[PDB]
Design brief:
It is classed as ribosome. This is part of a larger assembly, with chains A, B and C. By secondary structure, chain A is mainly alpha-helical. Chain A is built from six helices and two strands. In chain A, helix 3 crosses helix 5. Chain A starts with 19 loop residues before the first helix and ends in a 5-residue tail after the last helix. The longest helix of chain B has 15 residues. Classes of the chains: A mainly alpha, B alpha/beta, C mainly alpha. Chain B binds one RNA strand through loops.
Chain lengths: 153, 115, 57
RNA sequence: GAGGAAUACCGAUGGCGAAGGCAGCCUUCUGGCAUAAUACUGACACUGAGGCUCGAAAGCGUGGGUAGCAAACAGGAUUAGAUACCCUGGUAGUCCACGCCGUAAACGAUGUCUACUAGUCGUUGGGUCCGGACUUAGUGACGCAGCUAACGCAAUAAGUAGACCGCCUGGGGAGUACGGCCGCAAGGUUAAAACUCAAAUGAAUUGACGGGGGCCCGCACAAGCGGUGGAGCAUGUUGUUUAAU
């Protein structure tokens, strides 16, 4: 807003892992307020990748892929006397997680697998090694930040 | 070949040129902000001067210069960044001098811009 | 405006001292005052306004 | 190496000059001013129509010079256009000598000279006393009384008076025409009328507005989520069509 910084809402964890990170990703996958549909999409993706990779605890795998997708430097528009400068700045960690989750969902939304859960699992697997449209978007953002790398205002 | 050198930091409002010569005045290497990929507004920044000084120093370091004294001239922004670049590139600075041409009320300046 | 860097001191402190010396020597002010030619009437106006401000404060 | 021009710092509501003006340094020629005391002349004064002199910059003539800057001019951009603003060049001019021109918001928009009228604080050049005190001639900032339509001025008056000179008499037409005079020219100077309009103005007040400044708020933007604009249909309106829609 314009005056204060709101106290953030509490997010209850996912029922089947007890992790607020997976709960927040379920929210990012959600549409029209359908928690059950979003939860089954995300859980199908997670069980698919877990059964394919033979990993007992996939929350750590999700943390790994999330930190791999997270950018560190984002380009912000600044105004100095009528000049629009694309100054690269750091990303605060909350925005880091939000951007990573949004990029993962929007990249998984455009793939070619049959089910959305299969699409999301394939995208998680791909970003685990370092490929996929989430990785391309992160690389694009880093590319623009380094392309400027000349305004430290 | 030469161990003592002079780094001239000619810095204008538009561009900054970093030349490195011997004590006598014969140029060994040079770099410019406009010759390092930056053009227009980016070219007249301290960062472009930093990379120009880095390139010029790394090109002239093969000659054998380790001792160098800098000669800053002009009002541009990269006049301070180029010296830090040279210092961090491993050059042993001898002295920092600011030899900029200052007329004693000589030739008439160009007219004031009406912008 | 010449600063002779001593032994073992960082180039950052050396350039801070050089910036101080160059600011003392009035280098950037003089190179600014030659950027465009200034008409005697505008010089006189600027000086008179400066004197009025300096006297008031 | 050649050349031309300007003289950073000092530098200062600092200085000098009647004004216009006048900045490196040195010599020569030369004006005024400020100051202390003594001596001297003895009203020799003030102002001043016509007149004469000087008079920024631009401009003109002849002869030199020509670095930078730069009218004009050329190209590049911007733009709807862009004979501009910005950019790159660039000639007259700016510089010198000798002459013309005679005009500037040539301003303090305040003629010159004289006397008197609370005060406070700076600064420049002298002087006299004991770092100050005082007194002078300038140069500033404040501030009474007084004045003023108000703003404001206020011993550097726009106060209180006096001397002489200049000028004004609604706004345009018009500082124009015609005629003189001056000028190489550009033009300057002196200076109407018809006609036309009931205004044109000054200062201040309240608002509003500003591609003025400062501070602040609103899903105003930014950060996001979902739409509308494309399809079919519902509904409303326009247009059209109808006897009417």
């Amino acid at each position: 807003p314009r005056r204060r910084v709101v106290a953030t809402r509490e997010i209850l964890p996912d029922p089947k892992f007890g992790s607020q990170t997976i709960a927040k990703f379920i929210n990012h996958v959600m549409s029209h307020g359908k928690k059950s549909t979003a939860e089954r999409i995300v859980y199908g993706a997670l069980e698919t990748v877990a059964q394919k990779r033979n990993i007992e605890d996939p929350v750590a795998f999700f943390e790994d892929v999330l930190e791999n997708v997270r950018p560190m430097v984002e380009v912000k528009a600044r105004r100095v006397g009528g000049a629009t400068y694309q100054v690269p700045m750091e990303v605060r960690p909350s925005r880091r997680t939000a951007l990573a989750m949004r990029w993962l969902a929007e990249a998984a939304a455009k793939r070619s697998e049959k089910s959305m859960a299969l699409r999301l699992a394939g995208e998680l697997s791909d970003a685990s090694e370092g490929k996929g449209n989430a990785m391309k978007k992160r690389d694009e953002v880093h590319r623009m930040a380094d392309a400027n790398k000349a305004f430290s205002h | 070949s030469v161990s003592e050198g002079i780094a001239h930091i000619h810095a204008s409002f538009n561009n900054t040129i970093v030349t490195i010569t011997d004590r006598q005045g014969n140029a060994l290497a040079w770099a410019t902000s406009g010759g390092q990929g930056f053009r227009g507004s980016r070219k007249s920044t301290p960062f472009a001067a930093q990379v120009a000084a880095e390139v010029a120093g790394k090109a002239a370091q093969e000659y054998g210069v380790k001792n160098i004294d800098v000669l800053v001239k002009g009002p541009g922004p990269g006049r301070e960044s180029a010296v830090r670049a040279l210092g961090a590139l491993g050059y042993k600075v001898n002295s920092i001098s600011d030899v900029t041409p200052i007329p004693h009320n000589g030739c008439r300046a160009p007219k004031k811009r009406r912008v | 405006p010449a600063v002779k860097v001593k032994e073992n001191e960082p180039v950052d402190i050396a350039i801070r001292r050089f910036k101080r010396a160059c600011e003392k020597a009035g280098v950037l002010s003089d190179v600014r005052k030659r950027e465009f030619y200034e008409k005697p009437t505008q010089v006189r106006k600027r000086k008179k306004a400066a004197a009025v401000k300096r006297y008031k404060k």
